[PDB]
Amino acid sequence: NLYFQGMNETPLRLLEMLTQTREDLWRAAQALTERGVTRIILTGSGTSYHGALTARTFMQRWCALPVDVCWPFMLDDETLARSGKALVVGISQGGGSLSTLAAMERARNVGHITASMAGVAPATIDRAADYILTVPCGETKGYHCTVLNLMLLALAVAGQQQRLDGEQRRSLLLRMEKTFNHLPALVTASQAWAQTNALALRDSADIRLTGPATLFGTVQEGALKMLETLRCPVSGYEFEEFIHGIYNAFNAQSALIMLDPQPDARQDRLAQILGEWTPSIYRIGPQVENNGLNLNFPFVNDEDFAVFEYIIPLQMLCAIL
Amino acid sequence: NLYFQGMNETPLRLLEMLTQTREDLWRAAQALTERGVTRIILTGSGTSYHGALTARTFMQRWCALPVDVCWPFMLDDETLARSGKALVVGISQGGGSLSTLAAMERARNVGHITASMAGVAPATIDRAADYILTVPCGETKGYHCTVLNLMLLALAVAGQQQRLDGEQRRSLLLRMEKTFNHLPALVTASQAWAQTNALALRDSADIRLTGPATLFGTVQEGALKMLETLRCPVSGYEFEEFIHGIYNAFNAQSALIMLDPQPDARQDRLAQILGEWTPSIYRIGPQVENNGLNLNFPFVNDEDFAVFEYIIPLQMLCAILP
Numbered sequence: 001n002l003y004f005q006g007m008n009e010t011p012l013r014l015l016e017m018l019t020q021t022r023e024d025l026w027r028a029a030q031a032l033t034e035r036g037v038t039r040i041i042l043t044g045s046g047t048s049y050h051g052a053l054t055a056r057t058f059m060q061r062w063c064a065l066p067v068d069v070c071w072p073f074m075l076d077d078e079t080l081a082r083s084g085k086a087l088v089v090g091i092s093q094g095g096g097s098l099s100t101l102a103a104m105e106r107a108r109n110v111g112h113i114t115a116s117m118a119g120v121a122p123a124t125i126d127r128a129a130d131y132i133l134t135v136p137c138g139e140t141k142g143y144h145c146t147v148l149n150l151m152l153l154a155l156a157v158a159g160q161q162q163r164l165d166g167e168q169r170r171s172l173l174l175r176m177e178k179t180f181n182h183l184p185a186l187v188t189a190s191q192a193w194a195q196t197n198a199l200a201l202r203d204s205a206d207i208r209l210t211g212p213a214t215l216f217g218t219v220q221e222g223a224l225k226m227l228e229t230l231r232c233p234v235s236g237y238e239f240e241e242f243i244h245g246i247y248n249a250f251n252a253q254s255a256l257i258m259l260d261p262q263p264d265a266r267q268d269r270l271a272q273i274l275g276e277w278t279p280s281i282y283r284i285g286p287q288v289e290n291n292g293l294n295l296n297f298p299f300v301n302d303e304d305f306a307v308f309e310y311i312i313p314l315q316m317l318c319a320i321l
Numbered sequence: 322n323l324y325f326q327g328m329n330e331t332p333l334r335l336l337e338m339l340t341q342t343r344e345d346l347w348r349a350a351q352a353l354t355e356r357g358v359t360r361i362i363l364t365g366s367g368t369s370y371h372g373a374l375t376a377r378t379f380m381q382r383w384c385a386l387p388v389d390v391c392w393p394f395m396l397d398d399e400t401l402a403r404s405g406k407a408l409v410v411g412i413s414q415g416g417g418s419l420s421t422l423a424a425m426e427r428a429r430n431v432g433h434i435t436a437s438m439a440g441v442a443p444a445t446i447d448r449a450a451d452y453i454l455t456v457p458c459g460e461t462k463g464y465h466c467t468v469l470n471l472m473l474l475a476l477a478v479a480g481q482q483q484r485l486d487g488e489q490r491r492s493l494l495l496r497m498e499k500t501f502n503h504l505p506a507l508v509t510a511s512q513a514w515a516q517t518n519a520l521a522l523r524d525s526a527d528i529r530l531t532g533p534a535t536l537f538g539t540v541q542e543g544a545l546k547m548l549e550t551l552r553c554p555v556s557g558y559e560f561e562e563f564i565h566g567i568y569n570a571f572n573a574q575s576a577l578i579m580l581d582p583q584p585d586a587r588q589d590r591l592a593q594i595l596g597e598w599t600p601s602i603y604r605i606g607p608q609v610e611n612n613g614l615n616l617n618f619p620f621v622n623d624e625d626f627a628v629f630e631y632i633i634p635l636q637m638l639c640a641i642l643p
Contacts, residue, residue, distance in 0.1 A: 213394035
């Protein structure tokens with residue numbers, strides 16, 4: 001299977017990114033600090049947008065700045081003019097979209113600093129970038145690399161502003177490395193689980209993914225890749241939004257895949273109620289019930305880096321269904 | 322069809338709002354200017370969220386401040402800690418979601434000023450509101466009234482900060498009033514159009530709505546209501562996002578409803594291209610070709626207030642299809 005060769009290599013591609021000197025990111029972090037950037041704006045579509053969503057919190061924290069995430073069209077002339085000076089970063093799994101290009105140029109015209117994050121070099125969006133921060137993918141991993149690239153930028157900014165010492169830099173790299181090394185085990189487990197529940201998930205009309213706000217980008221990306229690969233409806237919701245609009249988001253024909261990184265009364269309760277109506281409930285987490293449907297796996301569960309783990313079972317469904 | 326009595330009265334409800342003295346809006350405008358608020362954050366879900374999307378631009382311009390629109394869960398403590406002092410406005414068609422309430426309480430605990438925009442009074446979200454800006458509903462119009470409520474707040478802020486003189490004020494009200502007076506004719510035209518294209522839309526697997534950025538809130542809200550009423554898949558996309566992700570958002574079995582406020586080469590091209598593959602293409606605008614499928618209608622097309630017009634045809638499909 002061609003999709004496995006891509007998944008099996010992702011952990012190592014991620015590890016390699018930990019041992020590359022990123023002169024490009026440091027030049028960006030330097031300009032950011034010195035040229036009075038007041039907020040970071042991440043813009044793109046689909047996977048790129050989901051990567052930005054997934055990396056937002058980590059970026060806010062380490063950059064010590066607001067971090068906005070939106071679709072390129074939300075960045076019109078007026079929004080860009082009202083905003084304080086920002087580093088607008090256009091993200092793309094490819095060479096960039098017309099919308100993203102246009103957005104970067106509008107920002108650059110008003111005086112904002114721009115950067116490109118393409119999956120290839122040269123990219124079209126590089127034309128509008130003051131700093132090319134290309135995601136290193138040489139010649140599946142896309143989402144993962146995009147997320148780590150954004151986090152590395154956050155760390156570059158932290159260090160340039162002298163808010164990241166050796167002990168912090170190391171602790172972080174150790175945590176990232178620990179999670180990456182545990183992915184292969186999760187890939188194998190995910191395959192077993194994905195194969196065990198293939199018949200049921202196919203036999204559902206549509207599929208709904210949900211989880212805590214901390215994994216919103218995860219469920220969004222999961223939903224997109226399943227729609228894109230399996231060709232049937234799949235949507236990803238933040239848990240409370242799903243509850244609030246449950247009847248527009250689910251019926252007896254639907255299947256639910258829920259992300260349970262930690263015990264949660266409210267999520268357990270939803271699972272209990274839907275369970276009475278349908279047997280198509282699949283939960284993923286370290287302490288979920290070990291029936292045949294769930295994926296009970298000892299996730300590293302790093303508060304910042306578990307995002308690299310929880311997308312894997314969802315990607316596996318794309319590969320085996 | 323109780324949905325009509327609702328729609329028929331909406332234009333009159335909106336006109337009334339223009340002549341109401343809104344001390345509540347003014348107090349909020351005064352408090353904003355005096356307590357160093359640096360941005361407005363509109364938060365909510367569904368129709369409330371869409372209403373926020375629809376009014377964003379108008380608010381930015383007249384408040385002269387950045388305006389964010391996001392779901393409550395996005396407003397976490399770390400985001401509220403990083404943000405400059407803001408006016409967080411919690412919006413809920415009903416009394417409020419626990420999510421919006423929690424967001425407001427989180428903003429309040431860190432020093433941000435809060436405001437509530439519910440459709441009822443008292444509303445659950447009023448509990449965490451420094452300023453209750455209730456949408457004046459009395460006991461369909463919800464989305465219209467919420468968008469207007471938000472726009473009146475912006476005018477109140479512009480007034481307090483002496484950036485909206487009498488002539489500008491009077492001019493903006495004329496425009497709003499002209500759009501509102503033209504809605505009844507649009508309701509009659511929409512019903513006729515919806516009845517003419519009834520069967521075709523019923524026989525489509527799923528419906529996709531698209532439009533320019535300036536009407537994103539419109540296709541989002543229209544999508545949600547049609548899904549909620551017709552009980553089948555409906556999604557609203559911004560035009561270019563739609564082109565960029567076409568194969569995941571559309572196929573031969575799909576029906577497209579497109580909003581064409583003005584002539585656009587790219588939209589025409591898309592319609593021509595898709596037209597070869599499916600006849601289920603429906604365009605809404607003043608200059609759309611007058612075949613049976615499209616809704617060619619003389620919209621007022623106000624660059625700011627056309628939002629009150631283009632949602633009507635989509636709302637009419639909810640009322641007459643099922």
